[PDB]
Amino acid sequence: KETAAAKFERQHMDSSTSAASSSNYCNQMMKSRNLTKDRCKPVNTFVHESLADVQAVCSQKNVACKNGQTNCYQSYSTMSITDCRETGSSKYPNCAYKTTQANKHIIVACEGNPYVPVHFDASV
């Protein structure tokens, strides 16, 4: 199995690099993280901050989740993130992505005991 928390780390945490290393980044990462195993996941965001920093967002600004739930939190500071988005040549099993770096606030849904990030909601 894999807990919601471990799953979030797998799909969204990349503390090794401070930014989107290169145009090749998303292609390597989406595959490496097993995000292109059952289909090409259309979009995915990686956060280049420490695990502790991202978990701390659960005690930050409480905001509404896109699905209407109220367990979402927005970071007070901007964080380094990389957006991975499908290219047109993208054809399963040959998934292709466009790597895009930016500094934005992240919004994550948190749950459990301890209270940790379980889902990436949005970035603003």
Curated annotation (Swiss-Prot):
Keywords: Disulfide bond, Endonuclease, Glycation, Glycoprotein, Hydrolase, Lyase, Nuclease, Secreted, Signal. One of its GO terms (molecular function) is RNA nuclease activity. It is an enzyme of class 4 (lyase). Disulfide bonds join C26-C84, C40-C95, C58-C110, C65-C72. Glycans are attached at K1, K7, N34, K37, K41. Its main location: secreted. It comes from the Eukaryota. Belongs to the pancreatic ribonuclease family. Interacts with and forms tight 1:1 complexes with RNH1. Dimerization of two such complexes may occur. Interaction with RNH1 inhibits this protein. Monomer. This is Ribonuclease pancreatic. The chain holds residues 27 to 150 of 150 of the full protein.
